[PDB]
PDB file of C-alpha atoms in Angstrom:
ATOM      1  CA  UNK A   1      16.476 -20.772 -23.801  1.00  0.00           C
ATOM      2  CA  UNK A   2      14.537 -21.398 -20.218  1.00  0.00           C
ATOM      3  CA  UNK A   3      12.571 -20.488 -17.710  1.00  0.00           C
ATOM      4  CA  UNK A   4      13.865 -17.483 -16.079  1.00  0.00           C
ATOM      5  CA  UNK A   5      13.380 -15.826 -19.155  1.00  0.00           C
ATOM      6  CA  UNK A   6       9.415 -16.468 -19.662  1.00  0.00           C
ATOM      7  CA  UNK A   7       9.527 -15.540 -16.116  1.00  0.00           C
ATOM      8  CA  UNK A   8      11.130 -12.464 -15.711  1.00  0.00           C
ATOM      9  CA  UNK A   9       9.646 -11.117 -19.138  1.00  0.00           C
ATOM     10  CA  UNK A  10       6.429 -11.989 -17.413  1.00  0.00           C
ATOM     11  CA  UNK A  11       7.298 -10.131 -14.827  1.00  0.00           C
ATOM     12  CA  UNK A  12       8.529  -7.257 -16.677  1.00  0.00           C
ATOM     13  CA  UNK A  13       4.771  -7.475 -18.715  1.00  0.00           C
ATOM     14  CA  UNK A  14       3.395  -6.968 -15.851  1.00  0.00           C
ATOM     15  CA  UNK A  15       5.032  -4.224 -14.265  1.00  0.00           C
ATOM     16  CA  UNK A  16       4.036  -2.459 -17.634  1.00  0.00           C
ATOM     17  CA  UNK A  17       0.235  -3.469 -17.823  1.00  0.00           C
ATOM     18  CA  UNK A  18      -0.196  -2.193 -14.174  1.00  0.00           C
ATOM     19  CA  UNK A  19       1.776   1.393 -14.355  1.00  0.00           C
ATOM     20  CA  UNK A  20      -0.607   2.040 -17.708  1.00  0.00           C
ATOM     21  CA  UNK A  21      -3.948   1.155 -15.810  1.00  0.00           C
ATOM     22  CA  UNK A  22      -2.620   3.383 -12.679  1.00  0.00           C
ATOM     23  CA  UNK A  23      -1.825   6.378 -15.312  1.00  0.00           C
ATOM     24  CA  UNK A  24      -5.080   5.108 -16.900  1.00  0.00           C
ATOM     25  CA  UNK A  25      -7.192   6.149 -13.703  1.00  0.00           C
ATOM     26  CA  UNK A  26      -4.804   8.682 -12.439  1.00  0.00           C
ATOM     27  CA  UNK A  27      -6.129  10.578 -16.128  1.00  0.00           C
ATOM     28  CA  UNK A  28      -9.241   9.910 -15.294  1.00  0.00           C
ATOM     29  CA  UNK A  29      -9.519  11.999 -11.613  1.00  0.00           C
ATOM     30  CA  UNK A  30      -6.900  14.054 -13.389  1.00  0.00           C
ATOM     31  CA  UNK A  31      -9.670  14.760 -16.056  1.00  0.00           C
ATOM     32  CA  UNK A  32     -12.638  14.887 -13.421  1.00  0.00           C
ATOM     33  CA  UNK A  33     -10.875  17.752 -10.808  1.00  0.00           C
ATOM     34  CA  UNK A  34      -9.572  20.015 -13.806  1.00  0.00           C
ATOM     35  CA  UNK A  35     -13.436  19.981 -15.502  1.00  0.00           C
ATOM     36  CA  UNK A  36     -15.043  20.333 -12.258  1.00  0.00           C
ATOM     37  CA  UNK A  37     -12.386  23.719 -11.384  1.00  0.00           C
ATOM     38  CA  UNK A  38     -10.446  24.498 -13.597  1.00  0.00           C
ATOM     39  CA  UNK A  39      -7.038  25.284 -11.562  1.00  0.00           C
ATOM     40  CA  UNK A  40      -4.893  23.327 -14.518  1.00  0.00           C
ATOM     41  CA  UNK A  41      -3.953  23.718 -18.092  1.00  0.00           C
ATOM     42  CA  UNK A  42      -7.083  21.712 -19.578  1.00  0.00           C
ATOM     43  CA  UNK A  43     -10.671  22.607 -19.917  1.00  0.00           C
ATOM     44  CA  UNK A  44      -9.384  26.439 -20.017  1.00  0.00           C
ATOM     45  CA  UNK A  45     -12.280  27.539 -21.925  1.00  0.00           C
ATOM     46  CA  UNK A  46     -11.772  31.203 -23.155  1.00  0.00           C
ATOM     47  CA  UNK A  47     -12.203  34.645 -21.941  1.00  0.00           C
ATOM     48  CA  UNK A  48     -12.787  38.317 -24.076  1.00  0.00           C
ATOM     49  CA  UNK A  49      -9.721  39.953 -24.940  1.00  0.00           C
ATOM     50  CA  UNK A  50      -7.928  42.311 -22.812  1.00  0.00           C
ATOM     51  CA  UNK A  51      -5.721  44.039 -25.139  1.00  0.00           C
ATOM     52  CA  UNK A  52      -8.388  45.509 -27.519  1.00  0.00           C
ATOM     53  CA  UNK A  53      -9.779  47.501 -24.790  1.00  0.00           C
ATOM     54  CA  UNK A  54      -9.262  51.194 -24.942  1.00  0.00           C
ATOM     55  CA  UNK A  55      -7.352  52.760 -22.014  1.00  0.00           C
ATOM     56  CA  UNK A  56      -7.193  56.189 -23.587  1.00  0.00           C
ATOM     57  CA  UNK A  57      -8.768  59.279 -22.163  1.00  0.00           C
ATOM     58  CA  UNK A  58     -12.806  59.606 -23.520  1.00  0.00           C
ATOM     59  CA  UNK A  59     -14.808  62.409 -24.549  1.00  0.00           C
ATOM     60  CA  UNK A  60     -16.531  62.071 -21.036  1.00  0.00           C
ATOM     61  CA  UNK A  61     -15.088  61.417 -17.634  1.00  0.00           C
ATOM     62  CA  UNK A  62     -17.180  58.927 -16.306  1.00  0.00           C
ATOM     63  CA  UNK A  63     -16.647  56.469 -19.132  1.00  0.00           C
TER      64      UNK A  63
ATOM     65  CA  UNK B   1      12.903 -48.522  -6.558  1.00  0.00           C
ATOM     66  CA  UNK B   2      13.639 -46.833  -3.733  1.00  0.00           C
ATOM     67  CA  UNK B   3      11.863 -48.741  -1.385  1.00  0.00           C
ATOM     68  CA  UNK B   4      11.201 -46.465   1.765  1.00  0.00           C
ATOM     69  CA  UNK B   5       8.817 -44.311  -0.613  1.00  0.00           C
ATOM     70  CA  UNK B   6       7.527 -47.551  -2.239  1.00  0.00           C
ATOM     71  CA  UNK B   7       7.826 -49.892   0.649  1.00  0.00           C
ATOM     72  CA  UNK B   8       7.369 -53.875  -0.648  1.00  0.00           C
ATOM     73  CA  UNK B   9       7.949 -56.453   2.327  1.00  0.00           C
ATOM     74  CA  UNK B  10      10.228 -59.565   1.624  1.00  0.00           C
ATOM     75  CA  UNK B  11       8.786 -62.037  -1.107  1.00  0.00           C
ATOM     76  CA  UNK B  12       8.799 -65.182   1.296  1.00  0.00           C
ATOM     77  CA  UNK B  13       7.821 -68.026  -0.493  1.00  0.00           C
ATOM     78  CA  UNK B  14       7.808 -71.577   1.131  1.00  0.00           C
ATOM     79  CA  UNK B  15       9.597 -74.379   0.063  1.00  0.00           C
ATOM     80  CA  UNK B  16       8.204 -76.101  -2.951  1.00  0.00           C
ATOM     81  CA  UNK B  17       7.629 -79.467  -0.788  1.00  0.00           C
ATOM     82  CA  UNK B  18       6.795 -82.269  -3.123  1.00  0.00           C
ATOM     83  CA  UNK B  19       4.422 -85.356  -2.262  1.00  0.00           C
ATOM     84  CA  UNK B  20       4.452 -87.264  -6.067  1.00  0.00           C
ATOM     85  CA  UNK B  21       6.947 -89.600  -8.283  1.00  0.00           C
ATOM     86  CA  UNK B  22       5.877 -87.168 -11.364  1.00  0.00           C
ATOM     87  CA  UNK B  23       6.690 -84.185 -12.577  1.00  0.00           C
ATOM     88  CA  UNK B  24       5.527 -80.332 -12.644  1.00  0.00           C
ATOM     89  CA  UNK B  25       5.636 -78.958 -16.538  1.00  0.00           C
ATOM     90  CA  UNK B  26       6.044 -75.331 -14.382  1.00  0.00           C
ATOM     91  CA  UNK B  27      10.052 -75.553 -13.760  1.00  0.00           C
ATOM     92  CA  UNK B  28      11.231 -77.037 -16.822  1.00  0.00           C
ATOM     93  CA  UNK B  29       9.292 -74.954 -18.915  1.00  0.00           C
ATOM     94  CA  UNK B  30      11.026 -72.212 -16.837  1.00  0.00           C
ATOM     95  CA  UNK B  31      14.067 -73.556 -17.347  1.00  0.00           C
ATOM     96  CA  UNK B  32      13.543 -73.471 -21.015  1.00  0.00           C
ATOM     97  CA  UNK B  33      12.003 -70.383 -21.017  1.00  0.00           C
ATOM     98  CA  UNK B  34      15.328 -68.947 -19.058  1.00  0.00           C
ATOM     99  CA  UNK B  35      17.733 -70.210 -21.311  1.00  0.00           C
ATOM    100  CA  UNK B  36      15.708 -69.596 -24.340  1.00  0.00           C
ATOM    101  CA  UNK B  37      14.831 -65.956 -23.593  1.00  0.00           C
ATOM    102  CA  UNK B  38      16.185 -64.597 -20.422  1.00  0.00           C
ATOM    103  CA  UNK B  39      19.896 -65.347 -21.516  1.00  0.00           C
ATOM    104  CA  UNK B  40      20.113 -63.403 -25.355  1.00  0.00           C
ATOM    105  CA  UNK B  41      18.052 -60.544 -23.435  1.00  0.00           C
ATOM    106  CA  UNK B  42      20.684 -60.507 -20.800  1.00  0.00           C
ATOM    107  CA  UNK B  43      22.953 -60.535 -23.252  1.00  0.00           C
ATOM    108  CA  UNK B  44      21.728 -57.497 -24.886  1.00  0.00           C
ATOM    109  CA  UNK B  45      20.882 -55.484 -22.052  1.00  0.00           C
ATOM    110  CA  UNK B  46      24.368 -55.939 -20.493  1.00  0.00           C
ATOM    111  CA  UNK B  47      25.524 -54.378 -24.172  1.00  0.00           C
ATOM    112  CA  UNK B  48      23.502 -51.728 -24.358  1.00  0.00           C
ATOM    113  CA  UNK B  49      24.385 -51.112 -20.291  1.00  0.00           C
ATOM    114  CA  UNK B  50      27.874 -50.886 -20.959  1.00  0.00           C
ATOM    115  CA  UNK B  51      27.346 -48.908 -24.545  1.00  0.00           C
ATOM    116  CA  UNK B  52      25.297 -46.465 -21.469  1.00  0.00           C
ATOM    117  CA  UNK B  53      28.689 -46.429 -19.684  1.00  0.00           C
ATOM    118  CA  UNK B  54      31.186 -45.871 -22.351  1.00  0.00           C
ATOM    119  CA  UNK B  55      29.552 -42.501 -22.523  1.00  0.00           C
ATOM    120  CA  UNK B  56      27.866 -41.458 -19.304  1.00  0.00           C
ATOM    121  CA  UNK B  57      25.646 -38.029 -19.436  1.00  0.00           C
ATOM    122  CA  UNK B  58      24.105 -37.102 -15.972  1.00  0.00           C
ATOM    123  CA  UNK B  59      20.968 -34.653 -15.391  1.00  0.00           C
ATOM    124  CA  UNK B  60      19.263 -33.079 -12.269  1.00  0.00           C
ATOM    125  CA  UNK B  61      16.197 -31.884 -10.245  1.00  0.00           C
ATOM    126  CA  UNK B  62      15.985 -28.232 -10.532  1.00  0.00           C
ATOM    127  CA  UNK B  63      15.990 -27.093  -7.027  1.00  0.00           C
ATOM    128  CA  UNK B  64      13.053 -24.375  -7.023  1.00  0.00           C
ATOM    129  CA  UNK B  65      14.038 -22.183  -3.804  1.00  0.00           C
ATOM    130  CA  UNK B  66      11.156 -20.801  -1.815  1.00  0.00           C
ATOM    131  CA  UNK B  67       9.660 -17.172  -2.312  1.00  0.00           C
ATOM    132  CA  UNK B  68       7.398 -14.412  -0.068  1.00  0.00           C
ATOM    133  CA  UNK B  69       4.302 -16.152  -0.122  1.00  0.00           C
ATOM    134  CA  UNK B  70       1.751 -14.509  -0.966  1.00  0.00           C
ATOM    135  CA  UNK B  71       0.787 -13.554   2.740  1.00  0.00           C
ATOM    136  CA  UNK B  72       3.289 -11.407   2.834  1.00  0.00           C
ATOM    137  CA  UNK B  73       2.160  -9.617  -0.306  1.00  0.00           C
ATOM    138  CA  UNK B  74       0.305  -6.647  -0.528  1.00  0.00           C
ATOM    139  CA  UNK B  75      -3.148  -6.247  -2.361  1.00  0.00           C
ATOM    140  CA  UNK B  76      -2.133  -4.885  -6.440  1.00  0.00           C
ATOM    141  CA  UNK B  77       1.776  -5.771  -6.569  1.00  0.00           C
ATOM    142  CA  UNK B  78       1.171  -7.814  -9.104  1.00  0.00           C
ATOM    143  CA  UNK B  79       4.616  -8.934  -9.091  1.00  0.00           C
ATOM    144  CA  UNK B  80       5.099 -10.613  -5.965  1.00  0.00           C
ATOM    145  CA  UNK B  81       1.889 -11.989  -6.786  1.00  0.00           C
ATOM    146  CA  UNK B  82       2.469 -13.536  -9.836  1.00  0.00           C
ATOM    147  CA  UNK B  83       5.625 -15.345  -7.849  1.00  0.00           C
ATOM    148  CA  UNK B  84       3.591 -16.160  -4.792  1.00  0.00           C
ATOM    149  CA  UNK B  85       0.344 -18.031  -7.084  1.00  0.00           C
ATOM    150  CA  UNK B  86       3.311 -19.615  -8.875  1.00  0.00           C
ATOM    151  CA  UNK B  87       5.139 -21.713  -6.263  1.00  0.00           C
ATOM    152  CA  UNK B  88       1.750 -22.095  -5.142  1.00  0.00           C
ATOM    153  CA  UNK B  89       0.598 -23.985  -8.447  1.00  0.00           C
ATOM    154  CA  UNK B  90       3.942 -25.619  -7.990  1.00  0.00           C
ATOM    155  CA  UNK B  91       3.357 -27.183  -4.497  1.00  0.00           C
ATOM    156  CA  UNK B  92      -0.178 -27.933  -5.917  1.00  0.00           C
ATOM    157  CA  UNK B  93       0.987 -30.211  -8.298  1.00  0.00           C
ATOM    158  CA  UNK B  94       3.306 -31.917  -5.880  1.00  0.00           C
ATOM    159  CA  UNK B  95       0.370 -32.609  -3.349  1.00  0.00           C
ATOM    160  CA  UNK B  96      -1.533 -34.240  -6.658  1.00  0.00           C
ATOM    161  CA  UNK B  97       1.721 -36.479  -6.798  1.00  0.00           C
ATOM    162  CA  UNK B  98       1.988 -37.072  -3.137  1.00  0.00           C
ATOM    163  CA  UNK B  99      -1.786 -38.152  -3.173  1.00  0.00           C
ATOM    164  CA  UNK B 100      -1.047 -40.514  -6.455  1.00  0.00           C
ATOM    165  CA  UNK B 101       1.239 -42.307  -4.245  1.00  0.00           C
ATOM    166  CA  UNK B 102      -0.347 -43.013  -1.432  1.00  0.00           C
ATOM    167  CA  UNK B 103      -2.927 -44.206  -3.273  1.00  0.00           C
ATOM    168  CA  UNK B 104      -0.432 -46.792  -5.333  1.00  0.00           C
ATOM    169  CA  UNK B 105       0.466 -47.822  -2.165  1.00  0.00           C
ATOM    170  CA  UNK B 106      -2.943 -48.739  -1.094  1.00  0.00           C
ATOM    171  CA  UNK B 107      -3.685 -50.357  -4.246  1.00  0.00           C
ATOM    172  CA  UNK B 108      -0.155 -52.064  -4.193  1.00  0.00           C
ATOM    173  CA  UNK B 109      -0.621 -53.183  -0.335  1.00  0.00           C
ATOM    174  CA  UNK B 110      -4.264 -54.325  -0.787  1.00  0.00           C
ATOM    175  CA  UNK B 111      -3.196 -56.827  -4.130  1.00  0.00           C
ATOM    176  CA  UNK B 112      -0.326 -58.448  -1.727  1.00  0.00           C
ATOM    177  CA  UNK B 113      -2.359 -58.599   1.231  1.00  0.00           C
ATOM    178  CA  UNK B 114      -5.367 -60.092  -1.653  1.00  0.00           C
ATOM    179  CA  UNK B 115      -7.963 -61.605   0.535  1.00  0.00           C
ATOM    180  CA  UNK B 116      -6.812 -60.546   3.802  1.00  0.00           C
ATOM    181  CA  UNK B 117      -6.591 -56.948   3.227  1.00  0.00           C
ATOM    182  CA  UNK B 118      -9.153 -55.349   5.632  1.00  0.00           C
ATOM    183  CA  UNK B 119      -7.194 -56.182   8.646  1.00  0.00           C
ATOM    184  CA  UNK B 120      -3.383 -55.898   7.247  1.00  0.00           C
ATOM    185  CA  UNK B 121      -3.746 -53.119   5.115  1.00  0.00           C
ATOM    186  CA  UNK B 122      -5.317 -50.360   7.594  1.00  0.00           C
ATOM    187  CA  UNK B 123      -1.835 -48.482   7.880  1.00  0.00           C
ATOM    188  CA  UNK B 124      -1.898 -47.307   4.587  1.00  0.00           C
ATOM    189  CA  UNK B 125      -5.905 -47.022   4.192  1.00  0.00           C
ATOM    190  CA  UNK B 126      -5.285 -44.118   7.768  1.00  0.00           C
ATOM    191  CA  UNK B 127      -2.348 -43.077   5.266  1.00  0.00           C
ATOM    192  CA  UNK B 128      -4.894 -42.478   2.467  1.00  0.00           C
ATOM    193  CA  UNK B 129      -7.509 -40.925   4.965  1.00  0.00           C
ATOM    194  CA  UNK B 130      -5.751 -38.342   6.156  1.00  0.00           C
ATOM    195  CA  UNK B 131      -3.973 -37.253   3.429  1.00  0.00           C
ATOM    196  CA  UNK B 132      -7.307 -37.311   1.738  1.00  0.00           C
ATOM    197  CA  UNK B 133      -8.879 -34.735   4.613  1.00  0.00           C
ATOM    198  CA  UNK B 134      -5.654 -32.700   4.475  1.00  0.00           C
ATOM    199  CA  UNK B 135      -6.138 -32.397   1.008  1.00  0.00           C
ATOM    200  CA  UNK B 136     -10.033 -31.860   1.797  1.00  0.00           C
ATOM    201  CA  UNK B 137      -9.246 -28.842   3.777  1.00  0.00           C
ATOM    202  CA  UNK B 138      -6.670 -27.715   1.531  1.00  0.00           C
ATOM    203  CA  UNK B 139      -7.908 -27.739  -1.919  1.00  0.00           C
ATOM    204  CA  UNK B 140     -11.345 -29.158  -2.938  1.00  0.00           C
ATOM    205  CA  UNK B 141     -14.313 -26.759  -2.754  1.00  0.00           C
ATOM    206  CA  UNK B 142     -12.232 -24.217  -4.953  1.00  0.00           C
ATOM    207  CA  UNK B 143     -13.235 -24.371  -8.556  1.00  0.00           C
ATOM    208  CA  UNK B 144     -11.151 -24.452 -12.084  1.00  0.00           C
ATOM    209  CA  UNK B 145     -10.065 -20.884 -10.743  1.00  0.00           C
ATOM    210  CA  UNK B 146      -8.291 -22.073  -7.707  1.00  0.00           C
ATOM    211  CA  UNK B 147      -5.103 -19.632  -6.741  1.00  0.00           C
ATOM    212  CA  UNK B 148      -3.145 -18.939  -3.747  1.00  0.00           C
ATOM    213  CA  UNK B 149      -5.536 -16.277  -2.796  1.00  0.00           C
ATOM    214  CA  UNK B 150      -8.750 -18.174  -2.783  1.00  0.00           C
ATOM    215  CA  UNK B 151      -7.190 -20.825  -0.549  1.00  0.00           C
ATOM    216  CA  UNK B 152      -5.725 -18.562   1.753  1.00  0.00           C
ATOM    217  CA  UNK B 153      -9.522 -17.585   2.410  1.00  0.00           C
ATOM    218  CA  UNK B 154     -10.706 -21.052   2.525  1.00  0.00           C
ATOM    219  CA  UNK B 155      -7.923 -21.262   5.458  1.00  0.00           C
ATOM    220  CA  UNK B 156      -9.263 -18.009   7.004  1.00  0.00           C
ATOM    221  CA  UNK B 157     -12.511 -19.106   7.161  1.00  0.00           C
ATOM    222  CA  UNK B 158     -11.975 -22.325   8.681  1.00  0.00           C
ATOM    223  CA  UNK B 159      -9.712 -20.955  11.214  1.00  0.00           C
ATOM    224  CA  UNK B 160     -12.617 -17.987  12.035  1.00  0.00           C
ATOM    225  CA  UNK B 161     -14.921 -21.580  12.289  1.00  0.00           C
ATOM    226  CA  UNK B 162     -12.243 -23.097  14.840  1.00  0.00           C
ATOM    227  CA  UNK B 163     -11.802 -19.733  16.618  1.00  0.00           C
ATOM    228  CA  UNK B 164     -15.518 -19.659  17.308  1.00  0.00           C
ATOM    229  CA  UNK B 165     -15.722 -23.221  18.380  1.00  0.00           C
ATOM    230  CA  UNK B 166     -12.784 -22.840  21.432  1.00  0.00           C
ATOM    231  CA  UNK B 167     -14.769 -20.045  22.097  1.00  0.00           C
ATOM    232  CA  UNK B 168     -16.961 -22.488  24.157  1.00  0.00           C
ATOM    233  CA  UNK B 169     -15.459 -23.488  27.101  1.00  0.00           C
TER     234      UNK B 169
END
């Protein structure tokens, strides 16, 4: 075929390799702030219920 | 061939001058030898020259255009980078060439000039020399590894070396 196309499949290789290892450390802090405070969808870890508290009125006032 | 990058000076010879009544077995032997061999050769070769030109086919140099070097490249684009280290290789091999022949031009000019070569053949020997400490400065302490960036800081450094020497006043 030629040259241009080893080289601009090369190039297009590339362009690949190095948007994966920028996601690939992006993930990483990603990971590290979301663990260390968790203001994002991961590393949620769970709470009690809510909804199987009783609102009702008690025997006693002060409940 | 082309004789400005291959220069040869004019093959004077002197006049063969003859002192005896006898003969030299040289030039009829040559003359022999010419019409033995040199004619059915000529013969051929002037067929197979004009077989050449009953169908002519023509081919070219590939023109490589120059590219940002890698100077103007910034540190993780890979991209530019991979163009910039590869007209770099490219003018690498060149210089190799360039240096192969200046040095078959030395060799060339020092057979010619035979026995009086180390007065007649200094042009190209300075030629050699600083081609050589071009080349010196340019490539040689790099290592199997060598790339556009590592000489680039083989040029910083020696122009932080220079800087600090016109320093002194």
């Amino acid at each position: 075929d030629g040259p241009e196309k080893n080289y601009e499949k090369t190039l297009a290789i590339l362009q690949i390799e190095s948007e994966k290892a920028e996601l690939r450390l992006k993930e990483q802090e990603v990971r590290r702030l979301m663990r260390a405070r968790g203001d994002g969808p991961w590393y949620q870890f769970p709470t009690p219920e809510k909804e199987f508290i009783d609102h009702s009125p008690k025997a006693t006032p002060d409940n | 061939w082309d004789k400005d990058v291959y220069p040869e000076p004019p093959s004077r010879t002197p006049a063969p001058s003859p002192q005896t009544s006898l003969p030299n077995p040289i030039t009829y032997l040559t003359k022999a030898y010419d019409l033995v061999v040199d004619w059915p050769v000529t013969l051929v070769r002037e067929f197979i020259e004009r077989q050449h030109a009953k169908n002519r086919t023509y081919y070219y140099h590939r023109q490589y255009r120059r590219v940002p070097d890698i100077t103007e490249c910034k540190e993780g684009d890979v991209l530019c980078i991979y163009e910039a280290e590869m007209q770099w290789r490219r003018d690498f091999k060149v210089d190799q060439e360039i240096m192969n022949i200046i040095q078959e031009r030395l060799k060339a000019c020092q057979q010619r000039e035979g026995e009086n070569y180390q007065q007649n053949c200094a042009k190209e020997l300075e030629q050699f020399t600083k081609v050589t400490k071009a080349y010196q400065d340019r490539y040689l302490d790099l290592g199997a590894y060598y790339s556009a960036r590592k000489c680039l800081a083989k040029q910083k450094q020696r122009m932080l070396e220079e800087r600090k020497a016109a320093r002194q006043e």
